Amino acid sequence: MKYIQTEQQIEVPEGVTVSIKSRIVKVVGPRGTLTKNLKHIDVTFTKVNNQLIKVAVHNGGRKHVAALRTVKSLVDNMITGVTKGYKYKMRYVYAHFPINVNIVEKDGAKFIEVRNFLGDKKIRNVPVRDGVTIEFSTNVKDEIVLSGNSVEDVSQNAADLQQICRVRNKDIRKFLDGIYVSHKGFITEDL
């Protein structure tokens, strides 16, 4: 159909500055700086009133106008990451063998170590992506918490931790052992 104009709004809170060169977005907020390259989407950014950015697609097809809302969501998540942050809480689930999760250093790289998963003698190592902070949560049993500006990096770290603990050669409906994302929210409460 080639819709003439499609537009999306990106609200910018007070403490956030968005610098948009051709398609390189730099969002700066209280929690830090996030950067994203969007030169693969062919959209147009325009600053309206220093609190609102419009992103537009001109003469766009269905896939193009869907990518427009995808871009709006990506930039909104960048702004959310620099204002509130992103935190994923994962639970260790096991029937018999307690999963031992720790933080170790290998040439200054901050791996997450998983031992005794389903009794395996193998040691699973998941590198911590830069910008992601790991905290083992008290007051809740067997909880790991991943916090950071980029929801992409936080969720990818959580996904790596979850996928490294997949059960092989067993009925996974019965062997539910693993490390599963239990909650996805923001670092700052109720913001």
Partner 1 sequence: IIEPSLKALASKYNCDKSVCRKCYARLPPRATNCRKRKCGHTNQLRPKKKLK
From the number of C-beta atoms within 10 Å of its C-beta (0-12, 13-18, 19+), residue 84 rates as: buried
Give the whole-angstrom CA distance, residue 119 versus residue 175. Answer: 12
The answer to whether residue 1 forms part of the interface with partner 1 (CB under 8 A) is no
Least spacing, CB of residue 172 vs partner 1, in Å: 5
Q: Please, which residue, 85 or 178, has the CB nearer to partner 1? A: 178
Interface pattern 118-147 for partner 1 (x via CB under 8 A): ------------------------------
Burial 111-122 (b: 16+ CB within 10 A, else e): bbebeebbeeee
The answer to whether residue 173 forms part of the interface with partner 1 (CB under 8 A) is yes
Count of residues for the chain?
191
Q: Please, which residue, 28 or 167, has the CB nearer to partner 1? A: 167
If DSSP codes are grouped into helix, strand and coil, which group holds residue 60? strand
The answer to whether residue 155 forms part of the interface with partner 1 (CB under 8 A) is no
Q: Which of 14, 105, 107, 171 binds partner 1 (CB under 8 A)?
A: 171
Pairing of strands 100-104, 111-115: antiparallel
The answer to whether residue 182 forms part of the interface with partner 1 (CB under 8 A) is yes
Residues 53-112 that bind partner 1 (CB under 8 A): 91, 93-95
CA distances from 4 to 41, 61, 132, 148 (A): 17, 9, 41, 38
The answer to whether residue 176 forms part of the interface with partner 1 (CB under 8 A) is yes
Residues lying near partner 1 in the complex (CB under 8 A) are found at 91, 93-95, 162, 171-174, 176-178, 180, 182
